[PDB]
Amino acid sequence: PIPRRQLYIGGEWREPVKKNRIPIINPATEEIIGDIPAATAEDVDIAVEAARKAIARDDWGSTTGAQRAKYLRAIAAKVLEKKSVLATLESLDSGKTLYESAADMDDVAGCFEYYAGLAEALDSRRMTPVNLNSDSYKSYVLREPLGVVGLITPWNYPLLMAIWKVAPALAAGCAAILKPSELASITCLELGEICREIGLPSGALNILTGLGPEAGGPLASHPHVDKISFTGSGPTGSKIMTAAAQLVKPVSLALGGKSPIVVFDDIDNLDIAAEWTLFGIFANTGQVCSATSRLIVQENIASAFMDRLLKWTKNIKISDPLEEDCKLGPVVSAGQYEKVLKFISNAKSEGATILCGGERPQHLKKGYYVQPTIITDVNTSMEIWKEEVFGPVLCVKTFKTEEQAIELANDTKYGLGAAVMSKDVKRCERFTKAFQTGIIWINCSQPTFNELPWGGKKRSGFGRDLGKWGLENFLNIKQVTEYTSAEPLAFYKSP
Amino acid sequence: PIPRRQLYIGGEWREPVKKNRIPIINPATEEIIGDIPAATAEDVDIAVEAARKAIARDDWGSTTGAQRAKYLRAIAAKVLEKKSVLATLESLDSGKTLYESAADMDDVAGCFEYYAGLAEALDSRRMTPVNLNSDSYKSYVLREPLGVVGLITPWNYPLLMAIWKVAPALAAGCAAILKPSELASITCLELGEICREIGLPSGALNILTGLGPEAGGPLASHPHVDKISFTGSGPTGSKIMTAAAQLVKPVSLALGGKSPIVVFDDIDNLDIAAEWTLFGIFANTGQVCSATSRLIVQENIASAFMDRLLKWTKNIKISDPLEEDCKLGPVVSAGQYEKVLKFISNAKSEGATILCGGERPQHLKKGYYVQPTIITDVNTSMEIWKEEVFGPVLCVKTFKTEEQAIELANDTKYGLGAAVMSKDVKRCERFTKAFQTGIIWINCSQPTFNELPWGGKKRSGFGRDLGKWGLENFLNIKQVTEYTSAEPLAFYKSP
Numbered sequence: 001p002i003p004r005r006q007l008y009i010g011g012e013w014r015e016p017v018k019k020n021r022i023p024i025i026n027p028a029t030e031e032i033i034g035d036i037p038a039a040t041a042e043d044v045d046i047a048v049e050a051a052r053k054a055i056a057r058d059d060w061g062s063t064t065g066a067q068r069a070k071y072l073r074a075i076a077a078k079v080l081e082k083k084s085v086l087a088t089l090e091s092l093d094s095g096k097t098l099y100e101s102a103a104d105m106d107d108v109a110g111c112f113e114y115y116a117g118l119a120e121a122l123d124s125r126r127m128t129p130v131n132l133n134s135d136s137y138k139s140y141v142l143r144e145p146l147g148v149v150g151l152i153t154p155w156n157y158p159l160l161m162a163i164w165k166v167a168p169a170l171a172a173g174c175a176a177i178l179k180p181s182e183l184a185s186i187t188c189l190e191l192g193e194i195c196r197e198i199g200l201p202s203g204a205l206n207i208l209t210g211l212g213p214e215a216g217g218p219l220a221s222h223p224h225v226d227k228i229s230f231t232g233s234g235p236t237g238s239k240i241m242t243a244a245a246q247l248v249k250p251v252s253l254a255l256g257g258k259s260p261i262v263v264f265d266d267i268d269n270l271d272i273a274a275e276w277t278l279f280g281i282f283a284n285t286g287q288v289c290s291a292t293s294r295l296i297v298q299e300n301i302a303s304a305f306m307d308r309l310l311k312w313t314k315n316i317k318i319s320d321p322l323e324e325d326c327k328l329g330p331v332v333s334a335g336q337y338e339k340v341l342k343f344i345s346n347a348k349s350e351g352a353t354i355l356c357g358g359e360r361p362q363h364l365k366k367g368y369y370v371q372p373t374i375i376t377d378v379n380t381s382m383e384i385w386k387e388e389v390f391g392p393v394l395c396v397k398t399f400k401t402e403e404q405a406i407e408l409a410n411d412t413k414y415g416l417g418a419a420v421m422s423k424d425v426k427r428c429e430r431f432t433k434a435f436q437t438g439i440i441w442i443n444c445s446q447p448t449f450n451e452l453p454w455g456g457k458k459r460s461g462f463g464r465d466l467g468k469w470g471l472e473n474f475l476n477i478k479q480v481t482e483y484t485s486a487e488p489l490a491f492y493k494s495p
Numbered sequence: 496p497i498p499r500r501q502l503y504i505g506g507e508w509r510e511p512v513k514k515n516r517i518p519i520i521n522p523a524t525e526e527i528i529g530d531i532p533a534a535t536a537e538d539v540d541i542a543v544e545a546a547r548k549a550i551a552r553d554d555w556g557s558t559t560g561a562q563r564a565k566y567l568r569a570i571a572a573k574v575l576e577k578k579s580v581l582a583t584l585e586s587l588d589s590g591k592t593l594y595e596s597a598a599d600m601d602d603v604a605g606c607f608e609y610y611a612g613l614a615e616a617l618d619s620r621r622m623t624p625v626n627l628n629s630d631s632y633k634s635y636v637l638r639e640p641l642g643v644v645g646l647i648t649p650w651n652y653p654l655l656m657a658i659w660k661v662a663p664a665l666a667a668g669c670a671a672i673l674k675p676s677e678l679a680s681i682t683c684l685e686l687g688e689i690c691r692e693i694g695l696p697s698g699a700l701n702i703l704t705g706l707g708p709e710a711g712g713p714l715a716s717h718p719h720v721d722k723i724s725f726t727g728s729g730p731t732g733s734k735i736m737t738a739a740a741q742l743v744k745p746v747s748l749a750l751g752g753k754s755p756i757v758v759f760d761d762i763d764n765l766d767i768a769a770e771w772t773l774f775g776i777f778a779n780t781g782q783v784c785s786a787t788s789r790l791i792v793q794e795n796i797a798s799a800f801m802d803r804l805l806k807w808t809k810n811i812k813i814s815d816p817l818e819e820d821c822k823l824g825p826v827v828s829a830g831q832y833e834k835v836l837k838f839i840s841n842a843k844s845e846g847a848t849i850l851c852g853g854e855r856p857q858h859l860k861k862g863y864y865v866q867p868t869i870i871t872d873v874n875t876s877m878e879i880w881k882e883e884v885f886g887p888v889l890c891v892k893t894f895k896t897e898e899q900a901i902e903l904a905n906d907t908k909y910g911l912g913a914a915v916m917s918k919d920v921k922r923c924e925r926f927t928k929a930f931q932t933g934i935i936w937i938n939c940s941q942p943t944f945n946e947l948p949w950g951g952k953k954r955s956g957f958g959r960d961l962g963k964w965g966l967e968n969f970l971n972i973k974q975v976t977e978y979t980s981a982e983p984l985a986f987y988k989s990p
């Protein structure tokens with residue numbers, strides 16, 4: 001049962017000014033299952049106005065962190081109450097398996113749980129005295145809500161990616177304007193209903209669905225948006241930051257990757273190593289920012305590892321995401337599907353081997369299904385090696401030495417995550433410093449915790465999500481200097 | 496004795512490729528006293544190459560914080576050894592009084608002293624374990640040098656503004672490329688000589704003089720500059736950030752202000768309050784970012800306060816900055832001089848009173864001297880009230896209530912500093928939260944400490960200089976997750 005909602009502005013459901021709507025497409029069946037509102041510039045001004053009013057009123061602009069946490073704990077409780085419907089809708093809306101969708105629903109409530117406790121602790125650290133080598137000055141640092149924040153998010157983890165920004169923004173005390181992806185907005189709109197259901201103060205959270213240049217764009221060039229927190233592709237981040245530059249507006253950039261997985265011959269279990277290699281590149285149909293999309297395996301175990309990988313890979317169940325025991329679903333859209341398959345075909349033109357998958361599963365007549373693909377005979381000058389595919393596609397390379405492995409791992413414009421599979425501690429530490437990234441996985445690929453800073457360097461962007469970082473991004477920092485002497489400054493001659 | 500240097504690149508003095516030079520102008524005498532090298536795009540590539548090589552070599556890319564601190568403590572010791580020549584040159588080069596120039600020389604050494612100790616402590620907090628609710632995962636945060644950093648700085652505190660970025664960049668372990676203002680580059684180039692004199696590793700610090708679009712510009716669009724730390728005017732920050740957006744490059748923005756000074760009738764000393772009001776708007780010939788350029792005085796004391804202010808003001812000695820007991824010098828350039836006087840004249844056209852100064856001092860035939868100016872009969876729709884003047888110009892307004900005072904204080908596009916002069920504690924706290932800025936001064940205007948976060952919000956930009964913030968800006972943050980279980984992931988069916 002697909003819901004039909006409006007834009008969530010000022011605590012009420014509000015229709016878009018131009019009355020425009022965009023379809024909801026089912027990636028498993030290529031059918032229109034509904035429609036979402038498509039906001040425009042005028043809608044963004046109404047939502048910024050609603051956000052500014054929330055910041056000026058008492059039930060939001062004057063709340064303690066503890067008061068704000070009561071609300072986040074209540075949003076977590078509704079997510080957990082409706083886990084089954086939300087997980088089904090996230091699945092029907094993004095193509096993600098019901099299992100991953102329910103797993104993202106647990107993660108979402110856990111994120112509000114984390115930011116609830118952090119909002120309660122925020123009241124304590126609001127005032128931080130800093131000792132000085134002065135008998136005339138008194139100093140402290142005042143932490144306060146930054147104000148109006150624009151939250152532009154991607155479709156890969158529709159609710160989860162949004163929540164990474166919503167949970168800390170609200171914890172910090174900001175009034176947010178959430179703009180999710182036009183490919184997966186069902187759960188974000190439902191978040192609006194949860195907020196109505198928990199009585200969240202009006203304008204505290206504003207959810208605006210619609211096209212990126214149409215609804216995301218004006219938020220980036222709005223003179224009353226204190227900050228834009230952006231997650232998505234690099235070319236989009238450029239456009240956003242370029243617009244935010246005109247208004248000297250701060251913007252955070254969480255972008256893509258071509259993260260490497262380095263496996264060395266000293267692995268205790270070839271079956272556990274291959275299972276992590278699968279999860280790092282085929283979970284979420286490969287549509288993961290930190291996906292370990294380049295496998296740099298040692299020549300020694302390369303022969304053994306590839307056999308187990310492909311055995312495990314050919315075992316991945318590709319079916320309808322709502323089905324029982326499904327391990328792989330379709331990609332999000334038709335445009336994504338073609339781009340992904342164009343990458344597989346471009347690897348053929350260039351001279352690479354398609355050792356596994358690469359074609360459409362013969363049993364699924366409808367939907368954007370791509371077989372999990374493992375490509376070999378890959379050189380550094382190839383687009384497959386060079387660029388983020390965002391499909392269940394893995395390219396493979398061999399090495400002999402540590403130096404060779406480092407060299408290959410860092411031969412990328414990206415710098416999000418990296419995984420190092422080895423039993424040698426000091427080699428795992430060497431890789432910890434050599435990896436020109438923001439995330440290092442030791443003896444796994446992909447698990448994260450709220451308590452940790454998420455982000456990259458190079459073409460993967462700047463800024464850190466999660467941890468205390470994710471909350472501090474939405475805090476304005478005040479220097480409070482007080483002069484405590486009766487004595488005059490002594491600079492300037494007295495009349 | 497004016498020095499004639501080259502560009503400081505890779506530990507050696509290197510000539511600019513195009514052989515171009517730009518003059519050094521004396522603001523007190525309007526004479527060419529020398530020339531500085533004017534770097535171009537090709538020069539920026541050589542310096543980025545030098546910076547990348549320093550990051551790849553052992554004597555810089557492998558140093559401990561303690562090793563880096565030995566160097567900063569040595570740069571501080573040379574600054575203090577040559578205090579007298581550097582202070583004279585800063586004065587001849589910027590127009591700043593020898594007193595303020597020597598005071599900036601003390602501040603500079605103190606800043607390296609602060610960042611030396613912070614570099615020593617950096618080694619300890621390099622690895623930070625974060626406890627988890629997991630018996631299978633182990634996590635910690637790795638802090639490391641960010642890499643190659645571009646440091647674009649203004650002429651108001653030539654050496655001091657540069658040092659605010661140089662001291663933390665070098666403490667953090669980055670290889671910096673310093674680009675100072677073409678109006679005041681004498682001391683920054685001399686910093687190059689100090690670095691030669693202390694044996695600072697090659698490429699660790701690269702100093703590139705020259706025009707902003709010519710030498711600052713390519714640094715902003717260079718693909719191998721990890722981050723741009725920018726201080727200067729808003730329109731410049733736009734151009735820099737717009738260029739950094741193409742390469743999704745992080746950039747910090749320390750911009751201008753129209754900071755208010757709120758004085759209430761409950762002041763214990765009218766003479767101490769007026770002296771701080773002078774220092775906040777006439778020190779450095781008003782060329783201060785955080786200058787308290789708008790005085791919102793209470794109607795009650797307005798009559799009394801203005802008499803003492805003007806009495807103290809008419810007492811300010813305007814002479815040659817190298818002279819004995821000089822309290823005000825000339826503005827930096829001819830272009831600045833005209834812009835500043837155009838503001839004073841624009842206040843006349845608009846309907847304001849020029850209660851004090853506004854004209855050129857009758858006794859100085861040469862130089863860009865402007866009398867300290869106090870303008871009254873000022874309304875909110877006036878450019879004088881609205882925009883940063885960057886001259887010794889103060890505009891004045893009266894109020895009756897707290898609400899009226901807050902309203903006037905925040906009626907600006909800026910948001911750098913703010914000063915509140917009152918004996919009422921809870922009123923000083925109310926103003927602490929109401930002031931829509933990044934710096935609050937209680938019972939003073941302008942003093943800062945290294946230990947404090949410097950920066951603003953709104954049109955004054957984003958990011959924080961100084962404190963641990965200033966060092967963390969130059970640290971890449973790594974998430975280190977390690978899987979410690981023998982058990983398989985359980986996601987994906989085993990073959």
Ligand SMILES: NC(=O)c1ccc[n+]([C@@H]2O[C@H](COP(=O)([O-])OP(=O)(O)OC[C@H]3O[C@@H](n4cnc5c(N)ncnc54)[C@H](O)[C@@H]3O)[C@@H](O)[C@H]2O)c1
Nearest residue numbers: 153154155180181212213216217232233236254255256289
């Ligand atoms: N670094 C991270 O933490 C992280 C997390 C998740 C996804 N990602 C990256 O996100 C990408 C997938 O997301 P996507 O396909 O939604 O990216 P995208 O760039 O197409 O769009 C992301 C969001 O920006 C909006 N948008 C598009 N054009 C815009 C414009 N002109 N102005 C303003 N907003 C605009 C979209 O509507 C959407 O909400 C991949 O590259 C992936 O690696 C990164």
Ligand SMILES: NC(=O)c1ccc[n+]([C@@H]2O[C@H](COP(=O)([O-])OP(=O)(O)OC[C@H]3O[C@@H](n4cnc5c(N)ncnc54)[C@H](O)[C@@H]3O)[C@@H](O)[C@H]2O)c1
Nearest residue numbers: 648649650675676707708711712727728731749750751784
């Ligand atoms: N917020 C702070 O902490 C702080 C501190 C000091 C000064 N300031 C602000 O700085 C301003 C005074 O400085 P200014 O006159 O040197 O400012 P500016 O904008 O004219 O230039 C600053 C620097 O940028 C360079 N630059 C100019 N155009 C450039 C371009 N196209 N690309 C790259 N670099 C370019 C200049 O050569 C110089 O080094 C005032 O507005 C003042 O309030 C702010």
Ligand code: NA
Nearest residue numbers: 024025183184
């Ligand atoms: Na869709």
Ligand code: NA
Nearest residue numbers: 519520678679
């Ligand atoms: Na000059």
